[PDB]
């Protein structure tokens, strides 16, 4: 654990960090622009 | 130090004695209801029926 | 130890009770809607969420008691901070009941043309404001005096009579809630009546709910004082209980005066 | 001046027991094992399933 | 009464008459002509804030990360800040 | 340093917004309709000639926007 | 398992701040998708993409308003920046009452789920942002959508009350040593004042919507006309909440802007006591006026006169604040980085919004301009520009700190310029239409107003481009392979800093303090 | 009177109320353009003359005197100047010295209006009552506007006083015609009074400004102001 670490995150360490953060932000955007559209799609799928 | 405890003990005992007397007074009253009022428009409204619809809760 | 931590504030350790309580609140809210509108899973979901909130609250207070009584993490400063937080909570509740009182007053100063321009509406048999409501005020007044007696029991080093005063107060609060229940059952008018009945019952019901929660707070403090968890110098739970009960009594006094005295006049 | 109905050394024994374990706050004690890993866990699982079913039914207008 | 741990240490200190963190209030006279304006620290290097002021003037606040080996003078009011460890001088995070 | 990049990106942003607008409201890549009052292309014509003399239910035709259009009848 | 403990369980005010930031970004994207859908529907006269179902359009406007006014600015100003930078800045260890912090944040996402499910159930909540009683009555909706939305408001309100109690007790109790109240920075001060407003006002909203709920389902007559209980009661209560609600979305913005100007002008904030007292007075006079939102409903003349006077008096202190900020740039050694860009844009566009607000504050002018897009332009400049631009400024200024990396500068300036141009094009024609007289909240407009709404619709897509650029910036920051330096940024390299939070580390270690700061406190 | 394409500012006035509104807005805008241009100028000159290449020294002043009181006082007199006309407009618009000559109830139903010029009937049941429906898309002639034309418009005599009692029957509404400068709320329980006095003939258009249920913005209002003789003929013919 990293309670006793010099940096709370120490983000550099993880495995190349690039694909992980890219997917993270893209999935954040997908959840932000998928549900609002999906609500309208479902409402038209209804009556 | 303890005089305050004694004094509030005394007045709380007085309070509960008076309250018990007043409870004896209030009870033993028959409480006969008067006649139902005429059905004014603003009484007994049902905008959306209750889940336990026909009569309100506590009846 | 403090000499290595270099500051007397409190540093808590992780506990899933925040997230669990939030999940319980979501359960309670969806169950509330599904019971408000007729649905299959309504009642069971609402009850399950409500007991979930109760359980998480129980384990949360148990954890706080465990820390502060056995681990001893409460120092003077966090002791003060707890008082600060609870005074703020009481202020919030004051504003809530202020909003309800505003609803009543805005509905009862200038009654509309559609209830005759008069108050109370014709055909609503107002309670005599002196048979039951006066007894309820006397009961809560004696309960407040008993709470003060309990506080001066704890402070004066006499840590045995504190349980006697607390149990007397709990008995008075139970008598009060019983008489409020009797008043509800013997009511000559229901909630679905005019604005008078509606605001009366909403305000009185929330006041009674606050009475229930204050009473159970007092029961918890009574059990703690019987078990010895409180001392003359270091006791915040009892002080919170006393302040909350004084709050409930003051709200009842305003409620009695305005609604029962003025509204019936 | 009277201690309240307990010897107050049972509390000292309990203090020793709590300060003499090496876990987080919410897992100390044998009571809390059962409590704070089985009751809230299964309870939240059931709550989550019922919440999902209820949202589904309300949205679709089924099972009135 | 009953107490153990942090409250016990606090109350033992307040019964013995000592203040636990009395090193956390420097409260020294302004300036350094032949006497440094001194602070105290339990670690190697520590944060210190100067509001300056003989008693009439003052500058709002300046935070400087004071260290052991080098005295540091306040940027605006120009007074020295000489540190003196009263504990084990070590990097604050080890 | 970067004013080239900033200005170029601003102009590119305007271009992209224009393309999205053209596809979504001029050709409607997402289904929709257009009123019969705008596609006729002669409706505004009659709307203006009617601001000259707007029909009425009780009384002769009367003008609208007399001030801001400076259109009104004379001695009679 | 250790990571799920550290996230779902940990108290750690910094980590709760990070969670708040992620939630704020998600909610913001959702709100912008709703806004783009609204603009797409309003692009041309006629039925554009909704193809009818104006009920769905009303649902869309309601959901957009809730999402961005409750789940985007508040979880980012209070939860986002507040949680992080109150205890770090004030010079304190972990916040007071950490468990309340965690419970508030984890209450928020269930509130989000309630709001979306309210937008998704049988038909929807087409009642607007301000749920008015008779439309939200059970005769006119009969769905349950309004019940779900009301419970969403309950959960959000309870979470914000818990957070407000947290912040008030922390500022009053958890300060460092020697630090008198008049040495805590203006960010701390604005968070204190906004927390007081959030503690006092929000329970009134809870009471009003509880009363609406028991009017709908449990069949009371609080807002049913037959039996007394006019809807004016609900208007009064909701807006007694509503205006303190809107002087909460901008006060943390004021604090952040003060800090940014102070750190870019090489000099602290001019007239510190003036700033403090002006902000306290804004907080106090945010309560004494609440019906300046309902001039056209039938109040008597004297109430209208009084609320006119109250709005003017609340206008004065913001003027003091803006002039103070202008003064504290007269020093010199400015440096036009992106946080300074966004602070300057904040000041300018908030000035424009405030002047429009003054135009709206009078009575007769509100008689002519009630519920027309003039009001929409007013509060979109004020709220969007002010709050969101302060948010972006704070985000750059302190992503210098949270993650430890730093954004690329040309992309930061590109994003500022794109967003400024787009969102200032798309909201000025709202002023013009409001003057023309089109009513607010309509899916179709007469042919006359079709001229500008094609031009405003051209403004939303630029802002979408800006937001996509912003997320590219966030990703390139989180994967930037070049840490914090002196050539990149000159802030954190300061061996002497006005604010305490810059001289600690790149991210704070875990307790933010191996040992608390001190204060010399002379005159022995 | 009617909305115009690519229009800046208010429509045309046909009521002393609307004249007052135009004048008040113009005075307010005069003062506030002065304020805005001065603030923008001072901000720009502060940013530009101290741009890191002329003044690289912070110059360190933090306490200011006799200028803080100046920008505390001068905005106060600005507010006094821009609140002198508003109060006068309010307290000269409230008074109705003259008796109203007619009375036109405007009951705001759910998605369509209704009117009753009830003051012409000898009985109790009301004569001269009708409904104001929006004309659908395909029921228009080549000239009229879209979703803003009404069957059987409101008729009103011109150059003579009025008194319209706004009220509703289903949900909140608002009677709102901008060219007359009339906007008020129809709340299902109350009966709001609006005293207006048109000055010229012609037709004036307006819309609902409050969220009614689903056909909001399809619930329009049309008021004709016609000569008194023609109004008399129309009423006698409608009875
Ligand atoms: C938070 C406040 C907020 C914000 C930001 C916005 C943003 C926008 N709004 Fe919204 N709007 C409201 C609050 C807000 N709105 C309210 C309260 C109403 C009233 C509803 C009613 O009257 O009932 C309304 C109504 C409203 C309407 C009228 C609806 C109607 O009349 O039918 C319209 C019309 O187009 C509109 C448009 C827009 C547009 C184009 C934007 C664009 O600016 C889109 C926003 C752009 C951004 C730049 C912000 C996004 C930022 C991010 C996502 C990054 C976040 C960063 C982090 C947190 C790290 N809004
Ligand atoms: C976001 C926060 C916010 C802020 C800061 C403001 C600012 C102000 N608002 Fe705003 N307002 C809203 C939130 C906000 N408002 C919202 C959400 C709505 C829509 C509600 C709805 O949907 O119904 C609204 C709408 C609204 C209305 C109309 C409501 C209705 O009729 O439709 C009114 C009118 O009373 C009003 C009043 C004011 C006033 C007087 C100010 C003033 O405080 C502005 C102060 C700012 C300054 C004036 C600029 C700085 C001052 C100077 C530089 C000094 C010089 C100026 C003078 C000479 C004094 N607001
Ligand atoms: C405490 C913090 C975490 C709480 C998490 C609780 C989750 C509870 C389960 C939610 C659920 O089942 O939603 C179902 C509902 C189901 O919606 P639905 O009913 O539209 O499902 C569609 C079903 N078909 C495919 C047949 C049409 O899910 C949602 O509403 C999605 C919300 C996503 C939110 C993302 C943020
Ligand atoms: C506070 C709310 C507490 C709710 C506790 C759980 C209640 C589940 C439903 C229980 C139920 O159906 O109880 C029946 C009772 C009426 O009983 P009744 O048949 O009238 O009595 C016979 C006398 N002849 O009716 C009731 O008890 C009515 C309970 C209504 C609760 C509504 C809750 C709505 C959501 C609240 C969120 C907080
Ligand atoms: C915070 C959210 C709170 C949501 C509350 C929803 C409404 C709950 C009460 C609904 C009304 C009702 O059932 O009233 C019944 C009763 C009034 O009596 P009545 O039915 O008129 O009886 C006739 C003669 N006695 O009794 C009442 O009216 C009691 C009113 C008070 C109810 C208290 C509910 C507390 C819920 C706490 C949730 C915490 C989380
Ligand atoms: C509506 C909800 C109202 C909730 C009110 C919560 C108040 C919490 C007050 C608090 O945190 O008190 C701290 C106290 C810690 O105990 P302490 O006094 O420090 O003991 C010293 C021992 N040497 O904590 C305690 O002693 C525990 C007190 C538990 C009270 C539980 C009340 C339950 C109410 C349920 C309503 C449903
Ligand atoms: C936190 C982690 C939560 C993990 C579990 C989330 C999904 C819960 C779930 O399984 O809900 C059940 C629901 C389907 O409903 P079900 O009861 O299976 O259908 C009855 C038909 N005879 O499942 C669904 O309707 C699935 C809907 C898809 C989206 C799932 C996640 C939604 C919430 C995100 C927050
Ligand atoms: C950038 C992100 C863009 C995402 C676009 C997703 C499009 C999904 C889709 O196909 O939505 C279906 C529907 C489109 O309409 P549809 O019924 O296909 O009509 C065509 C008949 N002429 O969709 C609708 O009717 C409503 C949604 C329209 C598209 C909204 C895009 C919003 C982007 C915000 C960023
Ligand atoms: C308003 C309603 C919400 C409850 C407010 C309770 C105020 C309590 C005041 C306070 O200071 O409580 C402190 C205590 C947590 O103390 P802690 O932060 O752990 O301190 C460590 C120091 N030893 O605080 C607590 O333990 C608070 C626990 C609250 C649990 C609430 C669960 C339900 C949440 C609301 C759902 C509403 C749904 C409506 C439908
Ligand atoms: C300030 C916040 C934003 C307020 C926007 C208000 C816009 C507005 O009121 O526009 C309408 C105004 C008048 O419109 P108009 O067509 O002339 O007539 C309508 C009926 N009178 O039309 C206009 O405002 C159009 C521009 C008219 C000229 C105004 C000039 C003001 C600036 C003078 C700068 C002098 C040099 C400074 C260096
Ligand atoms: C009336 C409507 C508004 C009109 C606004 C008019 C603005 C005119 C601006 C003209 C600028 C001409 C600059 C010509 C080259 C000068 C030399 C140079 O290097 O200029 C660049 C300088 C920014 O450089 P700086 O930020 O100081 O550098 C830090 C980065 N190492 O550039 C600057 O300092 C430019 C600063 C512009 C400040 C404008 C502030 C808002 C005005 C409103
Ligand atoms: N399942 C319903 C039955 C009654 C409503 C349909 N007839 C209950 O709950
Ligand atoms: Cu306001
Ligand atoms: Mg209105
Ligand atoms: Zn100094």
mmCIF file of N, CA and C and ligand atoms in Angstrom, chain G residues 352 355-356 374 428 431-432 435, chain H residues 7-11 22 25-26 29 32-33 36-37, ligand 10:
data_model
loop_
_atom_site.group_PDB
_atom_site.id
_atom_site.type_symbol
_atom_site.label_atom_id
_atom_site.label_comp_id
_atom_site.label_asym_id
_atom_site.label_seq_id
_atom_site.Cartn_x
_atom_site.Cartn_y
_atom_site.Cartn_z
ATOM 1 N N UNK G 352 -20.804 41.274 -18.260
ATOM 2 C CA UNK G 352 -21.920 41.392 -19.204
ATOM 3 C C UNK G 352 -23.186 40.767 -18.618
ATOM 4 N N UNK G 355 -24.696 43.002 -15.819
ATOM 5 C CA UNK G 355 -25.420 44.173 -16.305
ATOM 6 C C UNK G 355 -26.781 43.782 -16.869
ATOM 7 N N UNK G 356 -26.838 42.689 -17.631
ATOM 8 C CA UNK G 356 -28.149 42.231 -18.080
ATOM 9 C C UNK G 356 -29.046 41.926 -16.887
ATOM 10 N N UNK G 374 -34.535 36.544 -23.116
ATOM 11 C CA UNK G 374 -33.681 37.509 -22.443
ATOM 12 C C UNK G 374 -33.186 36.950 -21.119
ATOM 13 N N UNK G 428 -25.772 35.348 -27.279
ATOM 14 C CA UNK G 428 -26.076 36.771 -27.423
ATOM 15 C C UNK G 428 -27.363 36.949 -28.242
ATOM 16 N N UNK G 431 -30.284 37.146 -26.144
ATOM 17 C CA UNK G 431 -30.665 38.504 -25.764
ATOM 18 C C UNK G 431 -31.574 39.119 -26.815
ATOM 19 N N UNK G 432 -31.178 39.020 -28.087
ATOM 20 C CA UNK G 432 -31.983 39.684 -29.117
ATOM 21 C C UNK G 432 -33.383 39.082 -29.234
ATOM 22 N N UNK G 435 -35.579 40.220 -26.413
ATOM 23 C CA UNK G 435 -36.116 41.552 -26.670
ATOM 24 C C UNK G 435 -37.253 41.503 -27.686
ATOM 25 N N UNK H 7 -34.824 40.994 -36.088
ATOM 26 C CA UNK H 7 -35.236 42.212 -35.413
ATOM 27 C C UNK H 7 -34.413 42.411 -34.152
ATOM 28 N N UNK H 8 -34.077 43.663 -33.870
ATOM 29 C CA UNK H 8 -33.320 44.035 -32.685
ATOM 30 C C UNK H 8 -34.218 44.862 -31.779
ATOM 31 N N UNK H 9 -34.397 44.412 -30.547
ATOM 32 C CA UNK H 9 -35.133 45.191 -29.575
ATOM 33 C C UNK H 9 -36.620 44.896 -29.556
ATOM 34 N N UNK H 10 -37.352 45.809 -28.925
ATOM 35 C CA UNK H 10 -38.767 45.622 -28.651
ATOM 36 C C UNK H 10 -39.603 45.798 -29.911
ATOM 37 N N UNK H 11 -40.831 45.291 -29.847
ATOM 38 C CA UNK H 11 -41.809 45.486 -30.906
ATOM 39 C C UNK H 11 -42.418 46.876 -30.751
ATOM 40 N N UNK H 22 -40.528 51.012 -22.648
ATOM 41 C CA UNK H 22 -39.455 51.368 -23.569
ATOM 42 C C UNK H 22 -38.557 52.436 -22.967
ATOM 43 N N UNK H 25 -36.397 50.961 -20.095
ATOM 44 C CA UNK H 25 -35.311 50.130 -20.599
ATOM 45 C C UNK H 25 -34.236 50.966 -21.264
ATOM 46 N N UNK H 26 -34.614 52.039 -21.952
ATOM 47 C CA UNK H 26 -33.597 52.851 -22.608
ATOM 48 C C UNK H 26 -32.753 53.615 -21.596
ATOM 49 N N UNK H 29 -30.437 51.061 -20.085
ATOM 50 C CA UNK H 29 -29.381 50.686 -21.012
ATOM 51 C C UNK H 29 -28.359 51.796 -21.184
ATOM 52 N N UNK H 32 -26.124 51.527 -18.154
ATOM 53 C CA UNK H 32 -25.350 50.301 -18.101
ATOM 54 C C UNK H 32 -24.355 50.167 -19.245
ATOM 55 N N UNK H 33 -24.591 50.791 -20.401
ATOM 56 C CA UNK H 33 -23.533 50.818 -21.405
ATOM 57 C C UNK H 33 -22.401 51.716 -20.944
ATOM 58 N N UNK H 36 -20.488 49.417 -18.544
ATOM 59 C CA UNK H 36 -19.779 48.321 -19.193
ATOM 60 C C UNK H 36 -18.566 48.819 -19.963
ATOM 61 N N UNK H 37 -18.708 49.915 -20.712
ATOM 62 C CA UNK H 37 -17.569 50.393 -21.488
ATOM 63 C C UNK H 37 -16.465 50.885 -20.565
HETATM 64 C C1 LIG I 10 -24.883 45.099 -21.943
HETATM 65 C C2 LIG I 10 -25.358 43.658 -21.939
HETATM 66 C C3 LIG I 10 -26.022 43.226 -23.233
HETATM 67 C C4 LIG I 10 -27.315 43.957 -23.547
HETATM 68 C C5 LIG I 10 -27.851 43.706 -24.944
HETATM 69 C C6 LIG I 10 -29.040 44.574 -25.306
HETATM 70 C C7 LIG I 10 -29.228 44.716 -26.808
HETATM 71 C C8 LIG I 10 -30.302 45.695 -27.177
HETATM 72 O O1 LIG I 10 -30.975 46.304 -26.391
HETATM 73 O O2 LIG I 10 -30.431 45.802 -28.499
HETATM 74 C C9 LIG I 10 -31.542 46.591 -28.981
HETATM 75 C C10 LIG I 10 -31.087 47.984 -29.314
HETATM 76 C C11 LIG I 10 -32.232 48.828 -29.792
HETATM 77 O O3 LIG I 10 -32.787 48.217 -30.978
HETATM 78 P P1 LIG I 10 -33.370 49.125 -32.155
HETATM 79 O O4 LIG I 10 -33.624 48.253 -33.321
HETATM 80 O O5 LIG I 10 -32.505 50.313 -32.324
HETATM 81 O O6 LIG I 10 -34.788 49.569 -31.571
HETATM 82 C C12 LIG I 10 -35.629 48.699 -30.774
HETATM 83 C C13 LIG I 10 -36.639 49.576 -30.097
HETATM 84 N N1 LIG I 10 -35.997 50.765 -29.483
HETATM 85 O O7 LIG I 10 -30.151 47.923 -30.434
HETATM 86 C C14 LIG I 10 -28.842 47.882 -30.152
HETATM 87 O O8 LIG I 10 -28.402 47.785 -29.038
HETATM 88 C C15 LIG I 10 -28.014 47.986 -31.396
HETATM 89 C C16 LIG I 10 -26.860 48.970 -31.255
HETATM 90 C C17 LIG I 10 -27.313 50.414 -31.089
HETATM 91 C C18 LIG I 10 -26.183 51.381 -30.771
HETATM 92 C C19 LIG I 10 -25.603 51.206 -29.377
HETATM 93 C C20 LIG I 10 -24.248 51.859 -29.158
HETATM 94 C C21 LIG I 10 -23.688 51.624 -27.765
HETATM 95 C C22 LIG I 10 -22.172 51.698 -27.664
HETATM 96 C C23 LIG I 10 -21.567 53.055 -27.981
HETATM 97 C C24 LIG I 10 -20.045 53.059 -27.998
HETATM 98 C C25 LIG I 10 -19.418 54.416 -28.269
HETATM 99 C C26 LIG I 10 -17.910 54.376 -28.459
HETATM 100 C C27 LIG I 10 -17.145 53.794 -27.285
HETATM 101 C C28 LIG I 10 -15.643 53.727 -27.504
#
